[PDB]
Design a protein around this ligand. Structure first.
Ligand SMILES: Cc1cc2nc3c(=O)[nH]c(=O)nc-3n(C[C@H](O)[C@H](O)[C@H](O)COP(=O)(O)OP(=O)(O)OC[C@H]3O[C@@H](n4cnc5c(N)ncnc54)[C@H](O)[C@@H]3O)c2cc1C
Ligand SMILES: NC(=O)C1=CN([C@@H]2O[C@H](COP(=O)(O)OP(=O)(O)OC[C@H]3O[C@@H](n4cnc5c(N)ncnc54)[C@H](O)[C@@H]3O)[C@@H](O)[C@H]2O)C=CC1
Ligand SMILES: O=c1[nH]c(=O)c2[nH]c(=O)[nH]c2[nH]1
Ligand code: FES
Ligand code: FES
Lengths: 1297, 49, 98, 49
């Protein structure tokens, strides 16, 4: 047959024309309208698309439940399963416990990741109603969250665990009743008796055969060896979606019993090639628990790799055979199968052979020695023998769900009773274009004794045998080489210990006890968290919620998937899809465009270019950007045009058929390129104070250096999205947009169209994150789509794929700084000169303002009497960089702390004392001559240093480092000062509009947009206090240019300050109008006053407005206040580094933050944690790599590694400063969004302390650029291994920009 | 009356907090709003006409 | 608007009140979330009532612009408006009449 | 109003009215209505929230 039949949320689906290219995600959202399931990445990384599958498993004879990525599941793989989405477990009328707990525990901010995390937890509970803490954490290896900093999610869900004034009350959570879960569809149980018949599905381009038997599979593969096997689709889906490969015939063998069986033999365990890795895991775990240790060495090796192998969603469907045959050079399994000589059975029609994985199995890149007509039946994973030891190793950029830089299986067999080597196998991924054996090094060690000579022989052989070209794919050549030796070292030591336990301690020797920690398998203590904040006054009304931890108003709907983001809006029946076509050259003339292939794609409508722009092609904040490229392209990612088609699928296909011919022009890529070409945005910016010459002459010491700071991709979980709806009259258009800047969106659309602003309406209900990346760069999508709507007269929609968004929309500015600091032997700083350079990319955008804010924070917390900072913004052929939470502040302040770190080391004084004695005091002027009033930073410092027990912990750190040779701890406490207000004075304004309807209910709006920061929640708290009515009577629906005009972007942490005042004033106007009615009826309720005013013909509508007073700095006179007030905070962080791998644990972080009298401590603590964790990514994990020709390599979660659940400080404590009202902002609060981010530098400087200790163990003022990744950490821990592994020019994989 | 355009409503539910947007051929947005809100049992502030 | 040219009349009124051409003023629609608690369009009264409403909202805008008008009594409307915006003066107002 | 494009998921409503000046409703039978292709539901007083 050819009907596809499955269930969704208990409802039967019969699809008569299933296309094999249709994913479950697309089917849920577009065909069934169920938009709770989200698109976050399309490549298995983020988990936003997580759903549960149930089926009757014929082989285990029971109903099973597992999670999958809907983004990678072909619907054609889902015949006779039952899908459950977020909508299927609960809704706001009756929330599932999982939904209730994540909402009420403040575990949903932007809400875009909530459904997927809900579904991971839900599936766990369906499998294990009493999970451990460890199991809960493991449920989310495949889920990403950019907003929360993960703590609240884990803390909320800990309430489910067997072994599990406050922010939430677990006692109020309703209990779990598993009898109340959805029935397994009865029809599927009845169908379980029918034999499986082969199925055929035919799409636009692809034919899918679901084979029921081995005979049908082999027959098919003999007659069409081109038939592409698909099991889990976790490779093939990526190949199709991102590498534009098309396999017009697919066969899915997943149903076939012989590919799914598990057989225990005398030599080991045989897994059918279609067995999911989840089943390999459960089977090997059981065998490891019950068999003798001596037999399970290889099994534990496999398990060690599978620990850091994707998450539950991927492992549920990813087959063991799929990994083997894909034959990526960085397969984590193939090195272990090669090292252990695992036995593979291959079959075709009439043939059957058995082979041992060795070097010949992989004859070339992504090749195996299978014949075209052959399939893998099974792999036998062997028992270990007496005297046989195994280790597996993986080092990536992040532990969880990452691509290995190096990965390895290592096996030794000893001649019985001896420590003499009978066999030795060292196999590696990530060191060549295939999985390799060290076949030249290991023969030489046969018959040697396991000793220091063997260790040194093997390392010198590995350094010689495993060479890498300077240009090797993946770069990090020094690190990779170093890892092969370091992994061998760990294996060497581990084998010593294993010989020890075999009673051969006398022959091989004891392990030095300071070496023991080198061999430990990665392990974390359980998490411990503290949140401290201040109770409101006893006397405060229970209806006054200002200062209370009210949950985000949309949390319940975000948990239920009912909250609507832009792409969740139903399409109009006549709606069209747009796809951008972007430059593949950093700098070139466009010589011609051929759309001839695009025109052949079904549903193609048109290709828009600069010629189609009705009015002006000049856009961007400083009017230096094209809407569409005209004559030349100036970055890889520069938008040339836009395809319009019926569907996103046809628009993608048509975009690929737009062929562009270029002639290259000289490209300026790097900051150095830009300096050498005098390529900058405007003139040098400068702040200077005192006498630099005096100060340097007086200094006991002077230290000079440089620091490089890598950029950052926002990774808002919802990408850029616009719907433009033309109204057919008078140029009128309405746009629905994920943007922080409705005003600029409106302006830019209207100028492009040549219509007045009054014709264009921009609406924002909410964003799934913004973080600065939607302050301006959203408009490059909005303008394109508006033009399409204008041209066609039809609604048009575009949501960017993650790869497109990451390429086009730019990021945080990389900075290069050159510093010189003069200081006394006491640690007192007397002179500082810093030259800052940023890489701005190919339009100005906000670059100059970002550099201003960097210069405004080059002091961080420190009084420096003689100081000069300069900044220059580099104009380059890269995507334009823009706002990112911190807006230059973090870069400026890292530089400050970096030279400060060197001051302390040069003086030989404790860093905390050196920072404290340089700290400003109350009443001091900054370098830009602004007075520091209400300076809470010393209180934050004293509180943090005491509550974190910093001094006592320093003693423990020193002790650890004296007792461990190959792991080291570091500990650092860092302060911050962050100036609050836009650097551009007039942007410090906001407005609101309030209506009171005659039922007494209140509809409020203001200029701010909700992006997960709880702005609407705060404005409702504010309005409720101001009007003295419950929050329940006040509602905010959305943000719109036609309710509040001329709004500033939701930016600069200031939006609660600005909109809070506007809201307060609007409310005051309403109260003044109600006064006479309140006087006449002082008891009678709100509703009576309102009705009385109405029937007395009194207006119940008012605007409100605020501007921040007394702002305006001059660079010429170094006078006037840029800022209204400053935020203050301190963080102390502890780390443990692995000196052999570069990995590290974030052991503990303690934060004390001044948020004034918090409007909402639940939201504010969430902003502290979320900002802190983004900073943790900036400084330690997140790295963008570009080709030498300026092409971004890093375009998705596979390569771009944001913090994972497992990344956060194990012990994570946050205190909001008590008794610190800030009376110049709304209800004495302070802004919170950006200031905490820089406090993650505490982790950077803790790492730097740990490296210093490692360097003393095995050059003072060593370099540590940001981010301090495993590469940078490992390379800086110089030792006997790095020595053996250490060319211009010489082009390499990537260039530092 | 024989208005050439007869009575006509489109109601668009937003799936959040009872919110609903109505496009109506009416002289009386206020009573439209009131009457819809009372029938559904939601506040006036959820209903836009 | 039901064919009686109410929006036409309100644009004419606003243009006089503000002293700018009708071309610079637009009305898109009527909505309960821009003006609440409205009487029906009835009793022949709607241009009388809304015209006063419109006139008052326009007077509020004028009062807010007058310092910028005094400092450039010739400079065009567009310069007064942009000056007010960059001086962080509100360019939104309600109006009402009974 | 009716010139506005329909959403891809938009439904259509038709009122059912009395054919009597003054009467008790003794029963309502929707069996024939349920057979019409595309039928979703029949709303009555009991459906009012
Ligand atoms: C988010 C994510 C994380 C990942 N993490 C890791 C990781 O840490 N380490 C790692 O090594 N990999 C990783 N992978 C890669 C991937 O998950 C695995 O390689 C997976 O095992 C592929 O199996 P599949 O059933 O999904 O393969 P499919 O994509 O269906 O097929 C893959 C290839 O194998 C072929 N094939 C499948 N079965 C057979 C058979 N029986 N005979 C012959 N050919 C066959 C297909 O024709 C195809 O070429 C990751 C992938 C994703 C999406
Ligand atoms: N998406 C995810 O999150 C994860 C995916 N995987 C695997 O990662 C793969 C990534 O695929 P691709 O990006 O196409 O990369 P790939 O399969 O080409 O492997 C890239 C790596 O191979 C090595 N390599 C390739 N050529 C080399 C040479 N000439 N010299 C030295 N080393 C060389 C380098 O280690 C390089 O970084 C996926 O197909 C999947 O199998 C594994 C872990 C996580
Ligand atoms: O001074 C600022 N101006 C901005 O426009 C902005 N944007 C942002 O994210 N932070 C800041 N800071
Ligand atoms: S959208 Fe499927 S994992 Fe990200
Ligand atoms: S709340 Fe998790 S990505 Fe936003």
């Amino acid at each position: 047959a050819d009907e596809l039949v499955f269930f969704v949320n208990g409802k039967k689906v019969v699809e008569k024309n299933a296309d094999p290219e249709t994913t479950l995600l697309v089917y849920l959202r577009r065909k069934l309208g169920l938009c709770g399931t989200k698109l976050g990445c399309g490549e298995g990384g983020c988990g936003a698309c997580t759903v549960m599958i149930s089926k009757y498993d014929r082989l285990q004879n029971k109903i099973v439940h597992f999670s999958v990525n809907a983004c990678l599941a072909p619907i054609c793989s889902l015949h006779h399963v039952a899908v459950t989405t977020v909508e299927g477990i609960g809704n706001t009328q009756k929330l599932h416990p999982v939904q209730e707990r994540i909402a009420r525990s403040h575990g949903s901010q932007c809400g875009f990741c909530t459904p997927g995390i809900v579904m991971s937890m839900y599936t766990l509970l369906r499998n294990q109603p009493e999970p451990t803490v460890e199991e809960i954490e493991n449920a989310f290896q495949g889920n990403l969250c950019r907003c929360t900093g993960y703590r609240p999610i884990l803390q909320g869900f800990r309430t489910f665990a067997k072994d599990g004034p406050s922010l939430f009350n677990p006692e109020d959570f309703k209990p779990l009743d598993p009898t109340q879960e959805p029935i397994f569809p009865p029809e599927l149980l009845r169908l379980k008796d029918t034999p499986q018949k082969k199925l055929r599905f035919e799409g636009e381009r692809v034919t899918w055969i679901q084979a029921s038997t081995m005979e049908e599979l082999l027959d098919l593969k003999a007659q069409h060896p081109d038939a592409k096997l698909v099991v889990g689709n976790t490779e093939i889906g990526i190949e199709m979606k991102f590498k534009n490969m098309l396999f017009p015939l697919i066969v899915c063998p997943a149903w076939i019993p012989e590919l799914n069986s598990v057989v225990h033999g005398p030599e080991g365990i045989s897994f059918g090639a279609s067995c999911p890795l989840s089943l390999v895991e459960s089977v090997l775990a059981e065998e490891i628990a019950k068999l003798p240790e001596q037999k399970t060495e290889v099994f534990r090796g496999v398990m060690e790799q599978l620990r850091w192998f994707a998450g539950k969603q991927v492992k549920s469907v990813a087959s063991i055979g799929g990994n083997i045959i894909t034959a990526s050079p960085i397969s984590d399994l193939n090195p272990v199968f090669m090292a252990s000589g695992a036995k593979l059975t291959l079959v075709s029609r009439g043939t059957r052979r058995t082979v041992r994985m060795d070097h010949t199995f992989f004859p070339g890149y992504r090749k195996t020695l299978l014949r075209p007509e052959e399939i893998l039946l099974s792999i036998e994973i062997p028992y270990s023998k007496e005297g046989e030891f195994f280790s597996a190793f993986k080092q990536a950029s992040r532990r969880e769900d990452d691509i290995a830089k190096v990965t390895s299986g290592m096996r030794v067999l000893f001649k019985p009773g001896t420590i003499e080597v009978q066999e030795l196998s060292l196999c590696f991924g990530g060191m060549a274009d295939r999985t390799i054996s060290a076949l030249k090094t290991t023969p030489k060690q046969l018959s040697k004794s396991w000793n220091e000579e063997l260790l040194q022989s093997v390392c010198a052989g590995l350094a010689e045998e495993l060479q890498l070209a300077p240009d090797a794919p993946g770069g990090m050549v020094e690190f990779r080489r170093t890892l092969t030796l370091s992994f061998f070292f760990k294996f060497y030591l581990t084998v010593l210990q294993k010989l020890g336990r075999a009673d051969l301690e006398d022959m091989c020797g004891k392990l030095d006890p300071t070496f023991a920690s080198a061999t430990l398998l990665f392990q974390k203590d359980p998490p411990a968290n503290v949140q401290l904040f201040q109770e409101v006054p006893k006397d405060q009304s229970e209806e006054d919620m200002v200062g209370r931890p009210l949950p985000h108003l949309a949390a319940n709907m975000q948990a239920s998937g009912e909250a609507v983001y832009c792409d969740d809006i139903p399409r109009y029946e006549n709606e069209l899809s747009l796809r951008l076509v972007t430059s593949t050259r950093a700098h070139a003339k466009i010589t011609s465009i051929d759309t001839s292939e695009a025109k052949k794609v079904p549903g193609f409508v048109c290709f828009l270019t600069a010629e189609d722009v009705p009015n002006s092609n000049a856009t961007g904040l400083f009017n230096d950007e094209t809407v569409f490229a005209k004559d030349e392209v100036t970055c890889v990612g520069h938008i040339i045009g836009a395809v319009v088609a019926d569907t996103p699928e046809h628009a993608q296909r048509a975009a690929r058929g737009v062929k562009i011919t270029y002639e290259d022009l000289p490209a300026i890529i790097t900051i150095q390129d830009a300096i050498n070409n005098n390529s900058f945005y405007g003139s040098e910016i400068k702040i200077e104070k005192g006498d630099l010459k005096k100060g340097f002459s007086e200094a006991d010491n002077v230290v000079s250096g440089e620091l490089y700071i890598g950029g950052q991709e926002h990774f808002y979980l919802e990408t850029n999205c616009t719907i433009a709806v033309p109204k057919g009259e008078a140029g009128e258009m309405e746009l629905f947009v994920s943007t922080q800047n409705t005003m600029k969106t409106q302006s830019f659309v209207a100028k492009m169209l040549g219509v007045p602003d009054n014709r264009i309406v921009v609406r924002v209900k909410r964003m799934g994150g913004g973080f600065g990346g939607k302050e301006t760069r959203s408009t490059v999508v909005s303008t394109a789509l508006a033009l399409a709507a204008h041209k066609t007269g039809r609604p048009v929609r575009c949501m960017l794929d993650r790869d497109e968004d990451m390429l086009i929309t730019g990021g945080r500015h990389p900075f290069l700084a050159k510093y010189k600091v003069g200081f006394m032997k006491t640690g007192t700083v007397v002179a500082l000169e810093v030259a800052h350079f940023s890489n701005g990319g190919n339009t100005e955008d906000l670059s100059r303002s970002i550099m201003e804010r960097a210069l405004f924070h080059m002091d961080n917390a420190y009084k420096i009497p003689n100081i000069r900072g300069t900044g220059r913004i580099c104009k380059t052929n890269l995507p334009s960089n823009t706002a990112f939470r911190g807006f230059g502040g973090p870069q400026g302040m890292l530089i400050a702390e970096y030279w400060m770190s060197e001051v302390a080391i040069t003086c030989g004084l404790p860093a905390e004392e050196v920072r404290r004695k340089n700290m400003y005091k109350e009443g001091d002027l900054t370098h830009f001559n602004q007075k520091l009033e209400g300076f809470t930073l010393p209180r934050c410092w004293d509180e943090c240093i005491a509550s974190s027990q910093y001094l006592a912990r320093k003693r423990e750190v020193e002790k650890f480092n004296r007792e461990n040779c190959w792991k080291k701890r570091g500990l650092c406490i860092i302060p911050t000062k962050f100036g609050i207000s836009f650097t551009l004075p007039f942007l410090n304004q906001g407005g609101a509009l309030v209506h009171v309807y005659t039922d007494g209910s209140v509809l409020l709006t203001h200029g701010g947009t909700e992006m997960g920061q709880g702005l609407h929640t705060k404005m409702v708290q504010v309005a409720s206090r101001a009007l003295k009515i419950p929050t329940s009577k006040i509602h905010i629906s959305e943000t719109s240019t036609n309710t509040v005009p001329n709004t500033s972007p939701t930016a600069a942490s200031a939006s609660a300050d600005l909109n809070g005042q506007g809201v307060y004033e609007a409310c005051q106007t309403i109260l003044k109008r109600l006064e006479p009615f309140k006087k006449k009826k002082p008891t009678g309720p709100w509703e009576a006053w309102v009705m009385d005013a109405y029937t007395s013909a009194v207006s119940l509508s008012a605007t409100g407005f605020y501007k921040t007073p007394n702002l305006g700095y001059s660079f010429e006179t170094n006078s006037g206040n840029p800022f209204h007030y400053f935020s203050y905070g301190v963080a102390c962080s502890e780390v443990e580094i692995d000196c052999l791998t570069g990995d590290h644990k974030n052991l503990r972080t303690d934060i004390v933050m001044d948020v004034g009298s918090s409007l909402n401590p639940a939201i504010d603590i969430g902003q502290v944690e979320g900002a802190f964790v983004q900073g943790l990514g900036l400084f330690t994990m997140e790295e963008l790599h570009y080709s030498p020709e300026g092409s971004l390599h890093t375009r998705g979660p596979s390569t771009y590694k944001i913090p994972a659940f497992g990344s956060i400080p194990i012990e994570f404590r946050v205190s909001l400063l008590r008794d610190c009202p800030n009376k110049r902002a709304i209800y004495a609060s302070k802004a919170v969004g950006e200031p905490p981010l820089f406090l993650a530098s505490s982790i950077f400087f803790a790492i730097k302390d740990a490296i210093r200790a490692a360097r003393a163990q095995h050059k003072q003022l060593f370099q540590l650029d940001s981010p301090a990744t495993p590469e940078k950490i490992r390379n800086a821990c110089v030792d006997q291994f790095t020595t053996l592994c250490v060319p211009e020019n010489c082009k390499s994989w990537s260039v530092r920009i």
